[PDB]
Design a protein around this ligand. Sequence first.
Ligand SMILES: Cc1cc2nc3c(=O)[nH]c(=O)nc-3n(C[C@H](O)[C@H](O)[C@H](O)COP(=O)(O)O)c2cc1C
Lengths: 130, 163, 845
Amino acid sequence: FTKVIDEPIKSIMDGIHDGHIKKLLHQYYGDDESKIPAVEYFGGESPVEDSAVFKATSSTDEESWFKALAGSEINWRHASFLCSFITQDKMFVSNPIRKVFKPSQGMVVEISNGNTSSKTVVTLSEPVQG
Amino acid sequence: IADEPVKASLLLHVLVAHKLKKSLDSIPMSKTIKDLVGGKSTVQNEILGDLGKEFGTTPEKPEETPLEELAETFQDTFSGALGKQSSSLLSRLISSKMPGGFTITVARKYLQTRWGLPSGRQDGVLLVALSNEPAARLGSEADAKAFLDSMAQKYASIVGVDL
Amino acid sequence: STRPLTLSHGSLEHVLLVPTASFFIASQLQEQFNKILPEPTEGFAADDEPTTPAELVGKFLGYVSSLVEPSKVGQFDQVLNLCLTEFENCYLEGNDIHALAAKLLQENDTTLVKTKELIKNYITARIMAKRPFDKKSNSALFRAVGEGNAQLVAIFGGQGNTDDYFEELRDLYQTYHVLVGDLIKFSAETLSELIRTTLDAEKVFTQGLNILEWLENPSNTPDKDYLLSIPISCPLIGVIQLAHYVVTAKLLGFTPGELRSYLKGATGHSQGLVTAVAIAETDSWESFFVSVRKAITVLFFIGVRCYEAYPNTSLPPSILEDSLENNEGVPSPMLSISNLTQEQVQDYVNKTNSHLPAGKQVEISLVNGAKNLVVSGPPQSLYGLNLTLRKAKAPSGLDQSRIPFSERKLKFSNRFLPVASPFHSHLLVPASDLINKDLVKNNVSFNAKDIQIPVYDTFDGSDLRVLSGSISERIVDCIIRLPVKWETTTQFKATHILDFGPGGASGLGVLTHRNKDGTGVRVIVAGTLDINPDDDYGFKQEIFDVTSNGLKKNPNWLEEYHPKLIKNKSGKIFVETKFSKLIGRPPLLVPGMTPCTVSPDFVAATTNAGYTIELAGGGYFSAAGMTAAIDSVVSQIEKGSTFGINLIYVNPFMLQWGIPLIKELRSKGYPIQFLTIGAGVPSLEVASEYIETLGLKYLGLKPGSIDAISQVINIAKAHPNFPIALQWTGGRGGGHHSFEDAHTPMLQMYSKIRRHPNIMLIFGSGFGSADDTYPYLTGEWSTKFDYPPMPFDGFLFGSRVMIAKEVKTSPDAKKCIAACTGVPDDKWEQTYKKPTGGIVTVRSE
Ligand SMILES: Cc1cc2nc3c(=O)[nH]c(=O)nc-3n(C[C@H](O)[C@H](O)[C@H](O)COP(=O)(O)O)c2cc1C
């Protein structure tokens, strides 16, 4: 299959990728792009209600906690709570939102407009001076 | 006597011998599990279960390779531990053959006192005592002493340590 | 008004709240029980000594029931009823006793015989309390079947599964005495009557068939050699299958007919086909014993007439000692042969049948799988074939890992089955006519209209209800004469298979599981309580469990790992796989290559195209040299792009600066998404360091052999949440290459890899387009080898990308690459001898 000299790496890889997409579309979506399920962003998925109120305890499961805050719809808040890493310029540091909302006795997380991504507002509240 | 961790080689030898109801001499080490069992497959699945509980992971097709290759493969991830079920096998050995007042703690501290064998050797002498199961009520404490004295001698003759 | 009543055994204790009105009588048994109860010991590891509070309340139930009389109303009925009701409420959380038993095995330090005691006690208590199982259970499996989300098929095994079948019947008579005692006593009285009716039957039963005497008193049981002889083993294996069926019917509260209706179909392997037809007749508990009689009568007349057609003779000691010395079993009339194709075995039997006369000729009797065959014939003629086979096999302790795959000496096994008559062979043909003359004398017909469910023929796999003539004449013909094409006969569509047959985990069920792995069929072994550590097939508890664990689907790889399309908000369509879901780029990686991917300019250009590429550690000799390369890659890629590193494992000098440099660079948050360790798989403790301390997203591992694939599985099992990329290539790859075929090791290991959801299974070697890769994406690639579809999560392209514009390869080297014609997969192994398609294999330093 190594025949065409000085083909750009994009042209090779895209050719293979598109080849697969064209073949899957014909076999499993009846040659119709409109049957392809959409999302907002595709990635960071480990292989393993409008207005809500969560209350962290001592025994609260960290992974269950973040999943609850994240929601089910893939959107900005799903990334915010389940991305392990965020970018500073070209560097990959630990997601500071997960560090901040790390669950501990006292913390209360009130989500409002958790159906529309545009208008969602995750509020954290803690015992401050009682 | 110097504290040495139990070898994976003599552990595989004891488990396979004790499951097949024979002496530790009658099981050669340069031998496959299909060689020892033959046509019978009922005991194949529970032997492979006894390798998979003792060490955790096993190599692929462990029944068609010599116990020499299993011993050198298992010793790499095996460090002194008695596994899970082999602590219940010696628990069944002393609740059915050893008499009253013969708890492991009493037999362990006594063969540490008299013989001078530490925890790594205690394991080895208890595995040698299990392999040649006496199949008899050892009511006399002193006959059960001569028993563990003869099994500390058998462990000493196998490993090659003077006592 | 209720008074506490403590009953104890050393540390473990239980407190009944017995009404004061019955405290005086209940207090009596508490000391008698505690007198019967042995001395409390440490661990409770001794036999006849309860291990958990559940077993203790069990032992009590058992002891109380032993004093209660069922016919007469006794004083102890009242104390039995509330201690049973308490046991139910405090341990059986609406569940079944077999689910309790199974829980006490994998959590607590309880051995199998204690749980078998507990079950017996509970069941005896339940029947003595005059509380028969007449309420239909809420078992998750039979609920699902009612809904239409699970189709059951009942399979019944036969001979050759165990040398010790009779102890399986003993366990049923012990544990489920009350449920199957009447069945067993009926079968024993039926068999004894058939001996007194048939003329020369008594000649064949040298030590009689008083099976009640052998069950009550183990010492009066004859030796295993008598018990194995077909005139006993044939009917008794029938009984064991029927006893397992009855126990399953009674503990679910169903009539036989209801349980039969819940099954979509039912077949059996050899004589198991008689029991599979026998249940398809049945209906009410009152009309069960007429179907049982027919079944036991058939198996009795097969057993008798097939023994009088080919009775076993003494075998020369020379053949016995040669067999044992050369590590085969005691010769038998049926030789098992694993890991040889049926054409191969048929060649080796033609070799042996050419020399032998007509009446001494072996033949393939059972095809139990692609490569799992059983040859039937005279035990000498099979020992003949066994010598021919031993001559043509490799030693079992041979290292062929250094020999090219194509030249390897095929390694297989061959053992004699624990059977005593050459079933499915020309040798039993004379019995055919005699058997049928005896079934018409005892008025034993099966009629097509009476068969309520389909019963699949062992030869052609078709239903027996559509057969023209006598069905009994076809059942005989399928057992004594015609072969068994097991994969033909199990073509049925089912989500669940109930193996009632003898042998439990060494039975027909587990063989059928091997044959159907990855097609979404769960085998439940219906005649054995146990725990599968792998949990790939089920046990008796799955049938009776009422929680979700009762209804467990085995994965269908085509559906589980279906490649899908998905688009983002922008519009960009992606192929969605386990791998692409994680990294959010197409499932295509350019692997670490020395020297193609040492260039920072190529690693940037392939990252910027939106494809994953490893920077090759092979082309750097210090941390400063690699730090400077990486800094050049980070200066050239876009914001939030990443790349990986490839470190050679067999270069320990590279690893001792390589690993600390990654650890350092990830602490400063350099965009290193993963590390591939090429040229060998780390040990568990080194892998555990790499996984915990490097702050990586995933870890690439490139196993070469099946042993390396096992070491990857083991790493993935020790870190079940961390994603491992198992980059599998064959020997047909560019660069340093193994001796291994690309297909054969995946066919063997795919199932095991897929048990671990953190392994992203990447395929490499011999790829350069979307046409050659597609059959691996969709999984149709494995259908050529008769396996179910085995989809892959991703592909790597080494050689293909070596003539790209951005690769540093010199122009004359690109023209030289392009001039290589290459070869297809079957020719590649020629590179070891001569220039094959422009390429050749050479040894390194
Ligand atoms: C020029 C070249 C260099 C390679 N260098 C390495 C290397 O340093 N480390 C490694 O693990 N594999 C190396 N490989 C193997 C690739 O990682 C990959 O397994 C192989 O290229 C796939 O086979 P294919 O080239 O037929 O597509 C190299 C392959 C080629 C062709």
